[PDB]
């Protein structure tokens, strides 16, 4: 149920396809540094036993409410958050060099809830929010661009200077 180190030790640990490295988390449930899939992760915690060797984190298909409780992980480049219930984002996330975030199919409602993504310095190049209610709200794309200009590709679409300028105009 809980993400605990006993679970941290023994999931299917291997190397991504992309050759991204990691060591996974499954004594009986939810995982980390690879395939954190399908074990009903309520709250992220106990990332310390990850002890840094992980490029990627496939959190998908859990019951995560928010994204806090991230120990300092220099190595983590990619977070695959899909199919959870992320309502909010922490803010002091700042895991330096988090290049990719996958928020697909979650429950982030408001633009303002997206604000904490601006904190990601210049590393968050790829962000995908598609599948959230916030996407339907007006001027969603432009607000994400003006809020986090660090993003190079949003919703698998590329930013482009045209809508950068429109984001400036509004």
């Amino acid at each position: 149920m809980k993400f605990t180190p006993s679970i941290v030790i023994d999931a299917p640990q291997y190397y991504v396809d992309h050759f991204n490295g990691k060591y996974n988390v499954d004594k009986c449930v939810i995982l980390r540094d690879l395939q954190l899939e399908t074990d009903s992760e309520s709250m992220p915690s106990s990332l310390k036993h990850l002890t840094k060797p992980t490029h990627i984190l496939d959190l998908t298909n859990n019951d995560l409410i928010m994204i806090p409780d991230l120990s300092r992980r220099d190595d983590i480049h990619t977070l695959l958050l899909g199919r959870n219930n992320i309502v909010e984002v922490d803010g002091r996330l700042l895991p330096m060099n988090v290049q990719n975030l996958t928020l697909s199919n979650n429950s982030i409602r408001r633009f303002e809830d997206l604000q904490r993504l601006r904190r990601a310095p210049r590393t968050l190049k790829n962000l995908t929010l598609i599948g959230n209610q916030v996407c339907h709200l007006a001027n969603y794309r432009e607000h994400v661009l003006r809020l986090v200009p660090h993003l190079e590709t949003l919703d698998f679409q590329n930013v482009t200077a045209e809508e950068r300028k429109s984001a400036m105009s509004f």
Binding site: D17, H18, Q35, T60, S104, N126, F156
Partner: protein, 84 residues
Amino acid sequence: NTLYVSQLNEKINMQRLRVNLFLLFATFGEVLKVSMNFKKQRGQAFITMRTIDQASLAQISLNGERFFGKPLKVEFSKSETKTL
């Protein structure tokens, strides 16, 4: 276990295409394929999946999904992947 996708914006570089595909399809299960063998882009990507149910679920759920401007067309591969 392997799905054949086509009708994709080939203007995207190979490595970014592969990273976005792995990202997108990780929601259904572990993707085993590290890299596009076909090295021709034009949508023609194959995605290999460890279990078969994740391949079927990805196929049904991500049909015609807007991906880099274009609605992707997804089918089951004609042959089995060498890695399988």
